[PDB]
Symmetry: D2
Subunit: 388 residues, 4 copies
C-alpha cells in the first residue's frame, strides 16, 4: 500500500504554514524566512495542487507599487514553472498594530475604512491569480472585556463590511465567492462569529447571502469542544461549505495547528468519510504549523504527513462503507429509516394514525437495542486495518 498524493487530490497549503518561523508568545523564531518562490517549488515537488496567501505574505506591508509588481511577477513565474494553482486568497487584518481592536469592527471608524480598502485591493489581485474563494478570518474582531464592544453594533458593522464587499465583486463582474472562517477565541479573549453555526446564521442576514459560505477549521471548532464532522454536516446541509481548513488539535486549549491526522484521529476519520461521501469538490487546504522544534527537513516531513494521513483515512473510510458487513450493521441500526421521511403522508394523516400514539406500543419500541456499539467497533477495526 502507498499513499502518494497527486495534483488531482486538490491538496493546498498557505504560504504562511510551511513558512511559519516558529515565533510563539514565549519564544523567538527558530527558522529563517522562506521565499514564497521556494515554498511553491518545494510544495509542487511533494505533490500539492496549489497554494494560498494573505496579501502581506506575498507583498511586504508598505511596499511601493513598483515593488508590489516585482513580487507578483516572481510569484507568477513560479506558478507557471510548476503548474501550481491559487484557489483561495485572504487578507491580513490581524498582524499590524493598527488592527489591535479589529478591522471590520474596530471601534475607530477610520480603521474600519482602511480595513475595507486593504481588502478590496487584494480581491483584485486574487482574481488576477485565478482564485475562486476569498476567505475572511476576523481574528481581531472581538473583545477581552464586556464594555469594550457592543456586539449588536459590531454585527451591524460586520454586515455593512461584507455587504460592501459583495457590492464590489458584483459591480466588477468577478466570479469569486467569500468564505467566513469562524474561531471562538485567540488572539482576542472572545471572537465574534465564534463557530460554524454563528457564521451560517450571520450569512442569512447579508444582502446577497448566495455569495457567502463558511471556511471551517478542524482545530477551531474543537477549541469549543464541538464535533467537527457534525458542524461540517450542517454546513453541507445548508449548501455553504465553500472551503475547508484541515489540521489537528488536542482538545480545548490554545490553537495548536498540528498537521492533519494529529489531534483527534477518530474525528479526522469521520471527517474524511463525510467529505468523500458528500462529494465535496473544493480544495483540501492545510492550515497548520510545523512545530518550532523542527528544522526545514521536519517542515517538509510535516507537510507530506498532512497529505499522507488524508489519503490513508480516505482508503479506510471507503473500505468501511463498501464492506457488506458494515452495510448490514447500518441497516441493523436503522440508518436506512433515518433517511426516510417521518410523515410524507402529511399532518392530517399523522393526526389520524392510531398506530402513532393511541395504539403505539412504547415498551416494545423502547426494548429494541440500537446496535451502535457493534457498528462503532466495525468502524474502529476498519480505521486500524484490523479486519478479518
Amino acid at each position: 500500500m502507498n499513499y502518494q498524493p497527486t495534483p488531482e487530490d486538490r491538496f493546498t497549503f498557505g504560504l504562511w504554514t510551511v513558512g511559519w518561523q516558529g515565533r510563539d508568545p514565549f519564544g523567538d523564531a527558530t527558522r529563517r524566512a522562506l521565499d514564497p518562490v521556494e515554498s511553491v517549488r518545494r510544495l509542487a515537488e511533494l505533490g500539492a495542487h496549489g497554494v494560498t496567501f494573505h496579501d502581506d505574505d506575498l507583498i511586504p506591508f508598505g511596499s511601493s507599487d513598483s515593488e508590489r509588481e516585482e513580487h507578483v511577477k516572481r510569484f507568477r513565474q513560479a506558478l507557471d514553472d510548476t503548474g501550481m494553482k491559487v484557489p483561495m486568497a485572504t487578507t491580513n487584518l490581524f498582524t499590524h498594530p493598527v488592527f489591535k481592536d479589529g478591522g471590520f469592527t474596530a471601534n475607530d471608524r477610520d480603521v474600519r475604512r482602511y480595513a475595507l480598502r486593504k481588502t478590496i485591493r487584494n480581491i483584485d489581485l486574487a482574481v488576477e491569480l485565478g482564485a475562486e474563494t476569498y476567505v475572511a478570518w476576523g481574528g481581531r474582531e472581538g473583545a477581552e472585556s464586556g464594555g469594550a464592544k457592543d456586539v449588536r453594533d459590531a454585527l451591524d458593522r460586520m454586515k455593512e463590511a461584507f455587504d460592501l464587499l459583495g457590492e464590489y465583486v458584483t459591480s466588477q463582474g468577478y466570479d469569486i465567492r467569500f468564505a467566513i472562517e469562524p474561531k471562538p477565541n485567540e488572539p482576542r479573549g472572545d471572537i465574534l462569529l465564534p463557530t460554524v453555526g454563528h457564521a451560517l446564521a450571520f450569512i442569512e442576514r447579508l444582502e446577497r447571502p448566495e455569495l457567502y459560505g463558511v471556511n471551517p477549521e478542524v482545530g477551531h471548532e474543537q477549541m469549543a469542544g464541538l464535533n467537527f464532522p457534525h458542524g461540517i454536516a450542517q454546513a453541507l446541509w445548508a449548501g455553504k461549505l465553500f472551503h475547508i481548513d484541515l489540521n489537528g488539535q488536542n482538545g480545548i486549549k490554545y490553537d495548536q495547528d498540528l498537521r492533519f491526522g494529529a489531534g483527534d484521529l477518530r474525528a479526522a476519520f469521520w471527517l474524511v468519510d463525510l467529505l468523500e461521501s458528500a462529494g465535496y469538490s473544493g480544495p483540501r487546504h492545510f492550515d497548520f504549523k510545523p512545530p518550532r522544534t523542527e528544522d526545514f527537513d521536519g517542515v517538509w516531513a510535516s507537510a507530506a504527513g498532512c497529505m499522507r494521513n488524508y489519503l490513508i483515512l480516505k482508503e479506510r473510510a471507503a473500505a468501511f462503507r463498501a464492506d457488506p458487513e458494515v452495510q448490514e450493521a447500518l441497516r441493523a441500526s436503522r440508518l436506512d429509516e433515518l433517511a426516510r421521511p417521518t410523515a410524507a403522508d402529511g399532518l392530517q394523516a399523522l393526526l389520524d394514525d392510531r398506530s402513532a400514539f393511541e395504539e403505539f406500543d412504547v415498551d416494545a419500541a423502547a426494548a429494541r437495542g440500537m446496535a451502535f456499539e457493534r457498528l462503532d467497533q466495525l468502524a474502529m477495526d476498519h480505521l486500524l486495518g484490523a479486519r478479518g
Copy 2:
C-alpha cells in the same frame, strides 16, 4: 437597599427546577417529590410571576384521559388562587427509554411519529393554559459515535418535524411561537444544534422561520466555553430571542444548573446589562437545580436567590450606564464611533477617498490606546459597589 421581587419583574420557574429530587448519575434522590400545586403556591409567595412545565411534570406518563383532566383542573385552581401565569410549556422527549436515540431524529421512524403526536397533544394544552412560547430541547437528538447518526439526514428529519408543528399551529389558528433550546452535549455525547448559532442557522431553513426563535441557557453556551452575552446579542440582533433560561455554570464540565448569579458572576452582570438595555420583555425564567445537599428550606432559599441576584445585578448595571464618568469612558474608547456607519457615503466614495488608504496614517492610528482597561475597572467598581 432591598431587592424584593414582584410579579412585574416576570420571574418564572419550571416545575422541574424546585421539584428536582436530587437524583444524579451516581446517587439516589435526597428529597421527596413536590406536588405541582404546592410549588405554585410557594413560588407565588416568593414573588414569582409564573411557572412552566413539561407535559410529564404535570400529568404522569401514561395517565388515563380521566386522570389527565383531574391533574389539569387542580393545577388550574392553584393558578387561579395565586394569580400565577404559565407563559411557556415544553415536551418531555428525553426521560422515557423509548426516546433513548432521540424523539424527532430517532433512527426508528415509528418513534419519530410518536414524538410528534406527544408534542402536538401538549401544544393544545399549552394554549389552553395561556402559554405564549413553546420550547423544544432536543436533549436526546445526537450521538455517542460517528456511524450512528447521519447528520444531514437527521437535520432533514428535524426540519420535517418543526415544519409539521408550524403547519399544525397555523392551521389551528394558535398564537404561540416556538423556541429551540441548544445544548452542546449531555445526555448525548454530542447533541444536534449545539449552540445558539447552530440553532439560529437552522431556523432560516424552516418553511415559516418567523414562527421560530431561540431559548438560550446560560450554562449551555458556557459548556462550550462561549461568551453567553455575545451569543444573546447575536440572537437579539437577529430578532430571535423569544425566551431565555437563567442559571449558573462553573466552566466546561457537566451542566450544573446552579442558581442564577453563581458560576460566572461577571458574565451574569454583562447579561443583565444587555437584556435591560435592549428592552427584552419576555420572561426571566430560571432553569436551575437546587443542589442535592439541600432540604426544602434550601430549595426555597436557592430559588429566592435566583431572583435576588438578578435584581442586584440590574441595579448595578443601571448605575454603571447612568454614571457620567462611565459615559465619558465609553466615548474615550470610541463606542460612539462603533455605532456609526463605516461607509454611509457608499462604495464608490469609499474607493475615491484617499484618506482611507493612500493617505491614511497607519502609525498614528495604531498608537491610539483603546482605554478598555480603565472602562473595565469602572465596570468592576460598579459591580462590587465600590464607587467613590
Copy 3:
C-alpha cells in the same frame, strides 16, 4: 490477524460496568438489572480474567447478615465454576443520600464514622475473596460552593480516614494495598484530590505511605484536559501505579465512560505503549458504561471491544518499538541522550566546564532540528497499519 483475549491478559471488569442499567440525569433505565452471577459467567466466556465490585453491587444495601451470607456464597460458587478472580474491591460511599456531602470528609462527624465502618466491613470481605487492591473513589468529597468546605480541614479528615484504614489493615495482618482514584468533578462541582498529581502528593503525607498508590482513570484526567500517558508516567516514576481504570472520553465534558479505545485513540496507543514497555503487571480493568442505546447484545459487544482494542494497540505499539527505522528515528531525536545523566561528573565539574557556558555555541545548538515530526508520522503509520 486475530485478537482473542485469554485470562493471561488480566482483563477485568466491575460488576457495575456491564451491569449499568442506563439511568442518566435525564432518563430512566433502559436495561433490566443483571444478576452478578450472570455477569461473571458471561464475562468468563468473553475471556476476562476477573471481576471487581463495590460492597453494594454484591450485597443490597441494608441486607440482613443472613442475606449477606447468601449473596456471597452464590457469588463464590460462580467464581469457582468459572475460574474468575477478584483482584480489587471498593466501597460505595456515593449513592445513598446519607453521603450527599461526602463519606470521609462529610461535614457531619457521625457520617464520617459511618463511612469508615462501612469501608472496614468491606475490606474484610475483599480479603476473603482474595483481592489485592482496595480502591477508594471519593466521588462525593468536595463542594458546589466556596464556603461549604474548608479544604484544609477536609484534607485533615481525609488523612485521618486513610491513616485509620492503614492501621486496621496492618493490625489485622492483611496483604492488601489501597489505591486512590482521582476525578476532578462530577458528581460534586469540584472533587478533592482532582488529579493523579494531587493524589500522589497527598499520599506522601499519610503515616504509612508505602500502603497507598493511585488508580487513575483515562477519562478522569482527560476531563481536566490533561495528558493521561504523562500522568501515568509520573505515577510509574513514583512507584505508585497500583491499579488502572481503562475507558474512553471525548474531551472536557461529563464523564462518558466509553469503551476503551473510543475517545482519544492516539492517547490510548501511547498509554498501551507505556504500560507494556514499563512492565506494568497489574490488572487491566475496564471502568466503562455500555451506552444506554444498547440492549444486552450491545453490552457484551462493547465489553468485548474493550479487550479487542487493547490487544490491537498492544500489537501496534510493539511493532513500532521493534521497527529498526523507528529505533534510528529515536536516536535522531536524541531520546538516547535524554536517558543519560546531565551531570554525572558532579556540580563542581559542571561549574568548571567551559563548554557548558563560556564556550557553548548556542546558535549551533539552536539550529539542530529535533526530527519529532518524522518520528510522530512513523508512530501514526504503525498505529494505522500503513507501514511499507
Copy 4:
C-alpha cells in the same frame, strides 16, 4: 471607602508584566519597550512593594560582563531611590531558540548543562539583590507528540537538575528557597508537572524537599478547569505555598494573564479569603499582561487595578467572616464539625461503637439539609456589598 495600596500590602510585579510589548502569536508589538528603571519608578508611585525579574529582562541576552555590571548598577540605583525590594527572581529558559525542546529536560544533553549554568549565574545575582524565593517555570519542558519525550527519563532529568541546584545553594550557604510554577500547556502541547498537585508530588522525591515549594498561578490551574482556591488550600496544607502569581483567566483556553479580579471573580474572592485567613505572609505578585489594545496610560491603569481589586476583595472577605449571621450559618452547615477529628477515640473504640454502624440511623442523617445555599447567598451578598 478607598482602597489605596501601600508597600505594607506586599504587592509585587514582574518587569515583564507592565513591560509586555503586546506581541502575540498573530500580531506585532503595540507598545515600545520600557526601561526597567522606568518601570521601577512608576510602580513605586502606584504603591507597589517590589519587582521581580528574569535574568534576560534585566540583562540583555549575550551581554558582556562589563555591560552586565552596568545594567545591574542602574537597576540598583533605582531600587535605592524608590525603596522597592526584589523578593523573587527567575531564569528565562524559554525564549531563546536553543530552549525549543526545554532547558532542564531538553533531549540534547549539552543544552541541559547550559540551562543549569544559566540558572546558577542568575541565582547568585538574585541573592545579591536580596531575593528570598527563586522561581522555576519549565515552560518548554514537555512535548507536542508522544514519542518525542520519555516522561520517566524526563522526570529523572528534572529531578537531577533541581537536586544540583539544591546542592549549589546549600554549598554556597545561601538563604534562598525554590518555587516551582506549574502550567498545563502553552507553549508546549503538554507541559511536565502540569498542576499544583503534580508539582507537590514531584518535590517529595527531591533529595532536600524542604528547599522546594510551589508558585501556583490563578490562570494556570484554571486552564485545566480546576478550582484554584482548592489547589492553594492543598499547598498550604502541605506547608509548600512559597509564592503566588495572581491574575485572571476566562476558562479553558489560551492563558490570558488578565489583571487580577478579571476572569473568575468569585474564585478571586474565595482565594483572598483563604490567603488572608491562613496568614499567608509572602508577596502578592501579579503575573499579568496589560492587553495589547492599551497604551501606556492603560498599562498603569491595569496594574493599579490588580491592587485595587485585591484590596476590595480583602475587605469583603473580612466582612463576610466577621458577620455574626455568617458565623451562625457556618455552624448550621456544620463547618465546626468538619474541624473536629472523626475518631480521636481511636480505631478500636470506633470498631466497638454501635452508634457508628449497627445503630446508626442513616435515614435521619440523610434527611438533614446542609444549608449550603443560604450560606453561599450570604457570601454573594457580602461580595456585592448588598448586606442589609
